[PDB]
Amino acid sequence: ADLEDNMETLNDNLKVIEKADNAAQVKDALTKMRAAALDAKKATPPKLEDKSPASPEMIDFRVGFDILLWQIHDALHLANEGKVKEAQAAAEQLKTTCNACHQKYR
Amino acid sequence: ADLEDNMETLNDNLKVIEKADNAAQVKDALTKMRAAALDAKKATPPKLEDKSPASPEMIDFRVGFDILLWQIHDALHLANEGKVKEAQAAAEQLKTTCNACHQKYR
Amino acid sequence: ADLEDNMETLNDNLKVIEKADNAAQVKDALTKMRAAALDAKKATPPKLEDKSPASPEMIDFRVGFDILLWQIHDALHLANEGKVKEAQAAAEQLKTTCNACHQKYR
Numbered sequence: 417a418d419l420e421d422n423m424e425t426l427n428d429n430l431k432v433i434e435k436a437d438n439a440a441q442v443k444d445a446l447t448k449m450r451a452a453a454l455d456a457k458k459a460t461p462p463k464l465e466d467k468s469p470a471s472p473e474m475i476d477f478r479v480g481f482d483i484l485l486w487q488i489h490d491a492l493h494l495a496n497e498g499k500v501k502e503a504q505a506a507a508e509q510l511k512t513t514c515n516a517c518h519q520k521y522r
Numbered sequence: 523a524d525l526e527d528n529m530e531t532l533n534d535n536l537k538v539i540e541k542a543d544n545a546a547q548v549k550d551a552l553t554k555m556r557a558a559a560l561d562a563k564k565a566t567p568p569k570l571e572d573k574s575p576a577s578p579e580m581i582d583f584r585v586g587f588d589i590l591l592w593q594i595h596d597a598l599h600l601a602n603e604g605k606v607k608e609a610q611a612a613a614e615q616l617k618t619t620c621n622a623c624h625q626k627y628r
Numbered sequence: 629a630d631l632e633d634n635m636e637t638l639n640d641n642l643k644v645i646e647k648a649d650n651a652a653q654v655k656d657a658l659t660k661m662r663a664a665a666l667d668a669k670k671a672t673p674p675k676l677e678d679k680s681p682a683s684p685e686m687i688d689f690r691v692g693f694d695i696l697l698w699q700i701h702d703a704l705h706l707a708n709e710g711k712v713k714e715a716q717a718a719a720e721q722l723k724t725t726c727n728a729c730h731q732k733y734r
């Protein structure tokens with residue numbers, strides 16, 4: 417998928433998580449976020465379209481998604497243990513990383 | 523190790539997982555696949571040898587192993603929980619990633 | 629942070645894990661190591677400043693942190709299961725990755 421589509425997946429599934437009632441819904445939503453974050457790694461944001469895929473900005477962009485993936489991992493395992501409110505809180509701290517990337521590259 | 527040898531390791535241990543009887547066997551084979559996928563990620567595939575190392579294709583190639591690694595992660599945790607058939611089903615799901623990369627970069 | 633600061637974080641927190649009494653201490657040190665490894669991924673080591681950012685050497689460098697991150701993952705889950713001594717053993721194993729990178733790129 418293209419970058420904007422993966423971002424919609426991330427935004428929609430974060431909201432699913434905030435409204436979720438059980439761990440199965442949280443896990444499903446986090447797994448869709450993980451897929452979207454991985455697919456976004458191959459993308460070039462519009463503000464960097466003319467730069468090298470290996471420029472420091474593009475390597476930083478891709479590390480941003482690795483950071484997000486490890487945060488998704490933490491929430492996924494919290495949900496797996498049945499700690500639904502903890503998984504939802506961990507999902508909320510993802511926004512720190514969403515915003516940090518947006519500030520630089522959106 | 524070189525890319526062909528790492529792919530040998532991935533294919534051999536996928537077959538071990540398919541025929542395994544117990545969780546320890548599945549977990550051992552998955553651990554070897556994780557190691558091979560990481561070692562493979564540093565390679566330049568022959569199809570991309572004559573392209574720029576800074577090409578989008580090289581970045582995409584490496585994201586494919588990141589997808590594979592997160593799928594291996596799921597199967598590893600299922601095997602760690604002792605869920606042999608669920609871990610085998612998660613390992614079966616790797617094949618779509620294997621073939622999708624091959625279609626582009628073998 | 630720069631590479632040297634991230635290396636300090638990794639080394640200091642490994643020392644904490646080596647002297648830890650309980651899983652909470654180990655998990656806290658391992659999460660700080662995970663953050664430093666992700667941050668180090670954006671660095672260029674002095675020895676590779678004369679290489680392309682997409683050169684095989686720089687890919688090897690960045691993938692070395694992926695290897696470390698999955699080893700940090702193993703120790704984190706072992707600590708989460710209450711296997712403190714097994715987590716410490718896994719952190720000891722991590723050191724082979726640190727030294728192998730230093731041998732190549734320091």
Ligand code: HEC
Nearest residue numbers: 420423426427461477480481484510513514517518521522
């Ligand atoms: C970089 C490492 C990013 C991370 C982490 C996240 N996002 Fe993002 N986002 C990024 C870019 C470069 C862009 C611009 C895309 C464009 O073509 O303009 C975006 C954009 C969005 C959008 C708007 C997309 C659209 O349809 O117009 C949304 C709704 C969005 N991002 C959400 C989002 C969330 C919820 C994230 C974390 C959970 C997140 N992004 C992470 C880069 C990066």
Ligand code: HEC
Nearest residue numbers: 525526529532533567583586587590616619620623627628
């Ligand atoms: C890209 C991200 C890949 C993923 C994921 C997987 N494979 Fe692969 N594979 C890839 C390439 C570029 C190549 C060509 C290597 C060459 O030098 O020609 C291969 C090759 C194989 C092979 C044949 C090896 C040989 O002796 O030539 C096998 C048996 C193989 N790959 C198996 C395999 C399996 C089982 C995978 C998923 C579990 C898998 N590969 C993923 C690129 C990528």
Ligand code: HEC
Nearest residue numbers: 632635636638639673689692693696725726729730733734
């Ligand atoms: C590459 C993939 C590395 C891995 C994995 C680890 N380290 Fe490292 N480290 C690396 C380099 C290239 C350098 C040289 C940095 C420089 O600017 O000279 C280092 C350096 C250190 C240092 C000293 C830094 C300084 O103050 O001069 C320490 C204490 C250190 N590294 C520790 C360390 C630990 C504990 C690691 C694993 C847990 C580890 N490093 C991994 C490259 C890489």
